[PDB]
DNA sequence: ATGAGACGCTGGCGATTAGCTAATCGCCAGCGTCTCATCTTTATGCGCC
């Protein structure tokens, strides 16, 4: 028993994101419920983890001694 | 076997008399700490269907 609501604040962490996901979900679900009811053929969404280097994950990640 | 019907300075002033939002800008915003624990999550480091 989740409803449209109550399971975005469900989730964990703080209530910052929670109002910007119900947000993107209300919209997502109005996109799909306007151009003809039906689901669309893809849906691209950007993250926010990108690939570092070794040399300086490693370099900021060097125990102090 | 006669005695009613016919009605004004106002407009254009002053001069009281009375009364009201609005546009511009500035100011200035309760805050101080600690303890205690609690969980997460991240950077790096290790594995093949």
Do not use: F
Not at 33 to 44: A, C, D, F, L, T
């Amino acid at each position: 028993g989740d409803s449209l609501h109550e399971h975005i604040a469900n989730l964990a962490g703080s209530p910052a994101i929670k109002k910007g996901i119900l947000q993107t979900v209300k919209v997502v679900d109005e996109l799909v419920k306007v151009m003809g009811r039906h689901k669309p053929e893809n849906i691209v969404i950007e993250m926010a983890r990108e690939n570092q280097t070794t040399q300086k994950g490693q370099k900021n990640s060097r125990e102090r001694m």
